[PDB]
């Protein structure tokens, strides 16, 4: 049986737009049926990076196992529960992608995040995260204390260091993804504008799919 994304896109599904709650957990699929211009995509406006590349990989995946890799409950020094926007509604209330976390400052301070995760699963791990490009300097301090920030992500086969490009929603968000090979580790470091991973996907079944 196919995976029939409805008005949801691959990005919407994989990031977990609250509009895509039908696909919070998805059984094994044969192939994927996506629409041409799906209504429910990126919650918050922006770009999903290497989208075509990822869609291509999906043509070889038949099922994901979603795991929790950074518990929301483990952000001691950052606010992890008020990162919501009326662009991403759930039951008509401000929400956000379910698989990632919009970290905001706690008590006018955003300590440097230096987090790291070793893939002790026996399979390839698909990991998505993001960076927020804010409107203005005011928005920038209101959300993160630090006016000059960066996103830093790295594996054996990845080196990302991004600086947010500041200039219903007038800011943007970039999303990114990588595949973490078994026994490799991923390292996150940021002092603002970081959309952290909460859930990730083990690539559990392969063989032939396709996007339609």
């Amino acid at each position, epitope marked *: 049986k196919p995976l029939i994304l409805r008005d949801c896109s691959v990005a919407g599904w994989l990031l977990g737009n*609250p509009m895509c709650d039908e696909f*919070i957990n998805v*059984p*094994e699929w044969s192939y994927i049926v996506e629409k041409a211009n799906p209504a429910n995509d990126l919650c918050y406006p922006g770009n999903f990076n290497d989208y075509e590349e990822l869609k291509h990989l999906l043509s070889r995946i038949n099922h994901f*196992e979603k*795991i*929790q890799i950074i518990p929301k409950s483990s952000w001691s020094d950052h606010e992890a529960s008020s990162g919501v926007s009326s662009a991403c509604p759930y*039951q008509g209330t401000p929400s956000f992608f*379910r698989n990632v976390v919009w970290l905001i400052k706690k008590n006018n301070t955003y300590p440097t995040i230096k987090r790291s995760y070793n893939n002790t699963n026996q399979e390839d791990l698909l990991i998505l995260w993001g960076i927020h490009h804010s409107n203005d300097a005011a928005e920038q301090t209101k959300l993160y204390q630090n006016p000059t920030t960066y996103i830093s992500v790295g594996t054996s086969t990845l080196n990302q260091r991004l600086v947010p490009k500041i200039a219903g929603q007038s800011g943007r968000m970039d999303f990114f993804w990588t595949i973490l090979k078994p026994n490799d580790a991923i390292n996150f470091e940021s002092n603002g504008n970081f959309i952290a991973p909460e*859930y990730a996907y083990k690539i559990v079944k392969k063989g032939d799919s396709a996007i339609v």
Partner: antibody
Amino acid sequence: LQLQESGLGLVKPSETLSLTCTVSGDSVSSGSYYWSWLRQPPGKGLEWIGNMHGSGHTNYNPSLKSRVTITPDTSKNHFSLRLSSVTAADTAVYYCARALLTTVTTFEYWGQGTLVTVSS
Amino acid sequence: ALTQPPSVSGAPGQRVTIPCTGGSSNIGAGYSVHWYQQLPGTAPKLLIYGSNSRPSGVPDRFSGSKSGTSASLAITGLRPEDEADYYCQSYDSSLSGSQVFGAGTRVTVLG
């Protein structure tokens, strides 16, 4: 956060078993969690009944899918289990739980248990 | 179904292992194996989930591993208050999918 099961203790065969879970703190709205029923028959062994998400999307155990219904009561901080056409096989201690959205679902917080005997 | 032994035993301070073996459509297929502890009179409690990831309040001594179609819960430094029933859990991809449990293993402490 506390979870508490309740409902009839004795149910006739072929009728509908019914239970509600009463939740306190961060309620069955959210959308960050699964709201689930599990059970434990005589001569133990855990058995999964199903998960429900506040959006009304659900995932049931394939052995019971046709008999199970799990619904929320956002205006009451409840959710309910409804198992129809019960038999002696449905005799068990039933638990409710709040779970992570992992595909191998993570039953983080459990209720206390409530015995249900299907007998006639 | 997952299959575990009905009981294992050890003396306080030593190590005991609880195997949990499945098939090609659950553990062999690559899904995580979670573990739950049930003390005699009470509801179960989450002990290990994912790949050896312990919730707060679970000590270092509890550890899970997994290889092929079989998984394992290890208890080192056995303490008498560990006498409980342990259940392993996983996902099985048959028929739109199911959460799946072992029949439970009772740990007996001998000293």
